[PDB]
C-alpha cells in the first residue's frame, strides 16, 4: 500500500422495494486513517430515501 491509495466502488441494492445502483471513487491516507470519495447514483436516481443509510457501506 501507498500513503495515498485510490479506491473504486460499485453498489447495487433494494431498499423498501426501490432498486438502485451506485458507483464511487476516492482516495485516502491508509496510515493516517483519512479518506474522501465521490458517490454517484447511476440507477434508481433520484434516491427516494436518505443517502445516510448507505454511508457505512460506501
Amino acid at each position: 500500500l501507498t500513503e495515498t491509495m485510490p479506491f473504486r466502488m460499485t453498489m447495487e441494492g433494494t431498499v423498501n422495494g426501490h432498486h438502485f445502483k451506485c458507483t464511487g471513487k476516492g482516495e485516502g491516507n491508509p496510515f493516517e486513517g483519512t479518506q474522501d470519495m465521490k458517490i454517484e447514483v447511476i440507477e434508481g436516481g433520484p434516491l427516494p430515501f436518505a443517502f445516510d443509510i448507505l454511508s457505512t457501506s460506501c
Binding site: 479506491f7 473504486r8 460499485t10 447495487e12 491508509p30 486513517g33 479518506q35 465521490k38 454517484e40 457505512t56
Partner: protein, 166 residues
C-alpha cells in the same frame, strides 16, 4: 472502507494484514424505528487500486420516518468495539442519525469482518475501539454525493486501569 484506519498502541491491523488477498465484511444495521439495512462487501486490491463491491438489502423503513422522508442530517461521530469470535473479527457499534429539531434516531451495527487469509497467517487484535466520523455533502439531489471519513483504532486511554489492562 476499513483499510483507512490509523492504528495506535501497536494494535494489529486485521485489514492491512489481509492484503494482497483482501477481505469481506457483512453487516445488518437495525434502526430503532423498525428499519433494517443489510450489506455484504468485498474488498480486493487490483495493483495500485482498491476495489469495493457492495450489495444492499434494506427494508421496513417507516414511510413517515426521516429515512423515507429524506430528512436525515448525517451521522454523529461513533465508536465501534472490535474483538475476535470464531477466528474472525467482529464489530459492534451504535450510531445516531441527526434528525429535524435537534433529534436523533439510533441504530445498531452487527458486523463480521472476514480476511481472505487464514487465521494462522494473521495476528488477531485484542479487544479495541475504532472511532469513526462520517460527513456527507449532497452535491446533487439524490444523484451526487461527497463523503469524508476519519478513523482511529485505540485502547481506552481516557479512563485508565488500576489492574494493568488495556
Amino acid at each position: 472502507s476499513k483499510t483507512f484506519i490509523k492504528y495506535v498502541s501497536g494494535i494489529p491491523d486485521y485489514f492491512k494484514q489481509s492484503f494482497p488477498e483482501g477481505f469481506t465484511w457483512e453487516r445488518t444495521t437495525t434502526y430503532e424505528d423498525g428499519g433494517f439495512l443489510t450489506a455484504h462487501q468485498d474488498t480486493s486490491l487490483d495493483g495500485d487500486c482498491l476495489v469495493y463491491k457492495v450489495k444492499i438489502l434494506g427494508n421496513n423503513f417507516p414511510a413517515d420516518g426521516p429515512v423515507m422522508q429524506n430528512k436525515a442530517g448525517g451521522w454523529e461521530p461513533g465508536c465501534e468495539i472490535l474483538y475476535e469470535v470464531d477466528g474472525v473479527l467482529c464489530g459492534q457499534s451504535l450510531m445516531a442519525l441527526k434528525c429535524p429539531g435537534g433529534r436523533h434516531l439510533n441504530c445498531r451495527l452487527h458486523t463480521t469482518y472476514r480476511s481472505k487469509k487464514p487465521a494462522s497467517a494473521l495476528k488477531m487484535p485484542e479487544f479495541h475501539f475504532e472511532d469513526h466520523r462520517i460527513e456527507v455533502k449532497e452535491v446533487q439531489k439524490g444523484k451526487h454525493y461527497e463523503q469524508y471519513e476519519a478513523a482511529v483504532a485505540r485502547y481506552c486511554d481516557a479512563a485508565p486501569s488500576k489492574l494493568g489492562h488495556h
